[PDB]
Amino acid sequence: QPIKLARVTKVLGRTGSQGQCTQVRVEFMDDTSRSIIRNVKGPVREGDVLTLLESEREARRL
Amino acid sequence: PLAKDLLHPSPEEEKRKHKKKRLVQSPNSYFMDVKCPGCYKITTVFSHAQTVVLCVGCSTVLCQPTGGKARLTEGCSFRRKQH
Amino acid sequence: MRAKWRKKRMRRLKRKRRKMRQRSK
Amino acid sequence: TKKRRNNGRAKKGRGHVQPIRCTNCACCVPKDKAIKKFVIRNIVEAAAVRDISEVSVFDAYVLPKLYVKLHYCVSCAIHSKVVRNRSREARKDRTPPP
Amino acid sequence: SGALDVLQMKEEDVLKFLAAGTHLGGTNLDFQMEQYIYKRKSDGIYIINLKRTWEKLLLAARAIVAIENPADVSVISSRNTGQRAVLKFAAATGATPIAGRFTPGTFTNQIQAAFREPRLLVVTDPQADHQPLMEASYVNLPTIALCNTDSPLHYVDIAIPCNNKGAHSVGLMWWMLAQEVLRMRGTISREHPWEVMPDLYFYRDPEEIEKEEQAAA
Amino acid sequence: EDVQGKNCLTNFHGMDLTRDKMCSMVKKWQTMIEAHVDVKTTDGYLLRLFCVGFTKKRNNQIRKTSYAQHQQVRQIRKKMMEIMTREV
Amino acid sequence: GRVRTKTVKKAARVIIEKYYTRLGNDFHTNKRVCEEIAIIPSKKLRNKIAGYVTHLMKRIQRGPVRGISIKLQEEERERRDNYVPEVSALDQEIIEVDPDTKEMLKLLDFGSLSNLQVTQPTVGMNFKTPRG
RNA sequence: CGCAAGACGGACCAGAGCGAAAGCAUUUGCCAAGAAUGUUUUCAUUAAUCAAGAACGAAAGUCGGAGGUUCGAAGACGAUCAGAUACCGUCGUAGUUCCGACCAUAAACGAUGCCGACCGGCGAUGCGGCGGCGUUAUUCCCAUGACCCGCCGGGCAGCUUCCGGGAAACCAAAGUCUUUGGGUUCCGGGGGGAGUAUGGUUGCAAAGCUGAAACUUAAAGGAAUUGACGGAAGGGCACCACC
């Protein structure tokens, strides 16, 4: 499996037991019309690029 | 409605109400002139017959018994009679 | 004291009284 | 004080119904008394349907469903948060939640 | 009002009821409103008898014209459908309008700023305007109410059987009864039709206000 | 039933329904009707057919319940049993 | 947390309601209006009131506000609410009428009109919502 | 893959039906029974409620057989705990199942005796009957089914309401009650002592029915309200919380 890049198009909510993970709508900038919801640590704003070590998981929504 | 004319109810109301519960107790049954096509004569059948009504010498069966108003055989005409 | 177990203790106590009254008969 | 008018069950002209065994415990609950769910459920949730669709032999295979009918005792049901305590006015609403 | 040619139902008034649809009642029926219905349709709609509608309109008009002070007949609608009609009825009759949000205790609490104390309430719908009816229980207030086949006659003291749901039918009933009280006061003659148009009293969808503003140019 | 050589020749031993489908069919607010027929074919095969049937809520039906009378159900079951004996 | 308290809003509403015509959209002019037409002991509260005044003036430019009244009330609810069309939606050429509405007009004096199109009745008597 | 035995009839199954109640759920047949509707059928007061007396009566329990799949009082063992003759777990006798006899009790509840009249409304539903546009099956129409729309009677109920009642919760009955009387049976009289002692009676037994007193005590209790609390549910806030 390759290491791919995805752009944050929308930051949905703040999930995690202590509210420690932004839950984020990511758009694959390789396959420009494929989008998944995905959990992210640290401060995330709209339009910063995530480095995914796999692109096949999909987080459970708020 | 407080002021109902219990003296003089409309016919629609008494036709609706149970036979025993009417202002004057009146039956919903009736007698009827029934004739089969084979035989000449007209037999007086009771609407709620509850018996296998035969004509003279059993020309045919006229009325088959049911829950309420007994069914007349297909081809047997009736006129309900009053006085 | 639950009223059922009170009724069970009063039955056992009666059952011992019928056991001890019988031994004079 | 009489809390529920129906007495928390659904017999009006019986005087006896048959006991079901609660699925969580083994508690014997009158059928009418038991809190009943009908769970239709896909054999795989969300993460595994992605994998089966790709590793299926067949052409756009519709996945089968797993049809359970859960019977709960009142204690199991409340503990497992199937039903829930409501306000005395809101108790009377027999509408199932959306 | 009854057995009089002067106050008999005219031909143009029937066409104003049939276009508006005041004959065309609700799906459901109140036991208190069986006497103000001709017959039920196929496709469960009740047809209101417009003769009995007309007699209850006159009786209401009598009740209002009997009130010597025109100011202290408080005319009420909560729903948008009536809020225009009741405000134009104030213009005509010289009544007091309460269009939308009837503050509870406006008849019962003195120290409230909007403390009205009428002789007669007029009500667009007994259900929507339940709170004016109920405060009419606490102060001796006779109540005229525009009633549907569905409406309950709790605390309504003369019922005008109508379609009080539809936009046109409400405004038309308010127009009819405004024109009747001004006729029966002797302000307007009866031979000629009335200058004020029945279409004036109709509530319009805010879609239709900007649709007319578009179609005006 | 027999093996010729590198070939397991098979013969009928019973139709069944996937419980996915069987459970799917059984829903509330309607009458489930079943009929078994212990039957024999022309040759010496003895089958035990199991029919199933579900009362249909009609196109214009407003009533939720959609149930049958007990005599209606056993007229259906008598028909099921007649039809399955007829076709075996 | 920049929520205006009741003391700011009540003051700001009454200041618009009584001195509407002296106000505008600029903060700094109606800041000095609020100085004249009211005796406000604070400078901060003066600004708060002037600020919410200007916010309500922008809201009034859009449309009418629930907690204030304008002098005519206001060329739309007063003047435009006297709208009259060419011909009424009542004045219809062909009025469609039910056969049973024709019957209650027949048991009225009005058994024969010229401009009533009596329609065919609604077949398939099915008008309720199914249960559950 | 089979085979055997013994339990039990899931889903359909419902605020649905039936039964005096206990209770009753695979199919088919037989045997008698029953409510309700239908009736311009018959008898003509034959009725309602009931000391004595009588039938039925969940489970457990008892006696004699037949059987023993599962579950499981007692028991043995493993855990937990300070202890744990509990809760949890593995086994496991009586029992659980059938027939014949006992037993006569349950929160046997709707904690609401039975019969009769009257007093609002609305939507349902079950059964039977009656009427009505229209769809649909037997197609070849009749008449029957399946629907739809209403009416009537009886049934399990439901919602709503300043009928009215009630300490209130609440109740179309728990209403028609100081404006007190339709008929009738059972039964209560502060809390304990006590459903005990004693006598009688029934039972193989367990126990049932009947059933006090001495003595003791100023409250016990019912409904509702406010708080406090919870090892109940949900919501909110804080670096004297967390991340």
Core attributes:
part of a larger assembly; 7 chains; D: 98 residues; alpha+beta; first zn-finger domain of poly(adp-ribose) polymerase-1; 13% helix; elongated; E: Rossmann fold; 5-stranded parallel beta sheet; two-stranded antiparallel ribbon; 12% strand; globular; RNA-binding; ribosomal protein (chain G); structural constituent of ribosome (chain G); phosphoprotein (chain G); Ribosomal_eS17 (chain G)
What is the secondary structure topology, with strand pairs?
This is part of a larger assembly, with 7 protein chains of 7 kinds.
Chain A: E1 4-15, E2 21-28, E3 35-41, E4 49-52
Antiparallel strand pairs in A: 1-2, 1-4, 2-3
Chain E: H1 11-20, E1 39-40, E2 46-47, H2 50-66, E3 73-77, H3 80-93, E4 96-99, E5 120-123, H4 130-138, E6 143-147, E7 158-161, H5 167-185, H6 206-215
Parallel strand pairs in E: 3-4, 3-5, 5-6, 6-7
Antiparallel strand pairs in E: 1-2
Helix pairs in contact in E: 1-5, 2-5, 3-5
Chain F: E1 2-3, E2 8-9, H1 19-25, E3 32-40, E4 46-54, H2 70-86
Chain F binds one RNA strand of 243 nucleotides through residues 22-23, 26-36, 54-68, 72, 74-75, 77, 81.
Polypeptide structure, described:
Chain C has one helix and no strands. Chain C is 76% helix and 0% strand. Chain D is an alpha+beta fold. Chain D contains two helices and four strands. Chain D is elongated. In chain E, strands 4-3-5-6-7 form a five-stranded parallel beta sheet, with helices on both faces. A two-stranded antiparallel ribbon of chain E has the order 1-2. In chain E, 36% of the residues lie in helices and 12% in strands. Chain E has six helices and seven strands, in the order αββαβαββαββαα. With 88 residues, chain F is of the alpha+beta class. Chain F is 27% helix and 25% strand. Chain F has two helices and four strands; from the N terminus they run E-E-H-E-E-H. In chain F, strands 1-2 form a two-stranded antiparallel sheet. In chain F, strand 3 and strand 4 form a beta hairpin. The radius of gyration of chain F is 18 Å and the shape is elongated. Chains A and D meet through loops of A and loops of D. Chain F binds one RNA strand of 243 nucleotides through strand 3 and helix 2. Chain F: This is Small ribosomal subunit protein eS1. Chain F: It comes from Oryctolagus cuniculus. Chain F: It is found in: Cytoplasm; Nucleus; Nucleus, Nucleolus.
Strand order of the largest sheet of chain E: 4-3-5-6-7
Largest sheet of chain G: 2 strands, parallel
What Rg of chain E do the Cα atoms give? 17 Å
Q: What is the percent of helical residues of chain G?
A: 25-40%
Gross morphology of chain G: elongated
Quaternary structure of the protein: part of a larger assembly
Fill in the CATH topology of the domain at 6-62 in chain G.
Answer: Diphtheria Toxin Repressor, domain 2
Q: Mind telling me which CATH architecture of chain E this is?
A: 3-Layer(aba) Sandwich
Radius of gyration of chain G: 29 Å
Q: Name the overall outline of chain E.
A: globular
- Kindly report the name of the CATH homologous superfamily of chain E: Glucose-6-phosphate isomerase like protein, domain 1
Helices and strands of chain G, in order, run as HHHEHE
CATH homologous superfamily title of the domain at 6-62 in chain G: Ribosomal protein S17
Number of strands of chain G: 2
Q: Structural class of the secondary elements of chain G?
A: mainly alpha
Distance between the termini of chain E: 47 Å
Largest sheet of chain E: 5 strands, parallel
Strand fraction of chain E: 5-15%
> How many helical stretches of chain E?
6
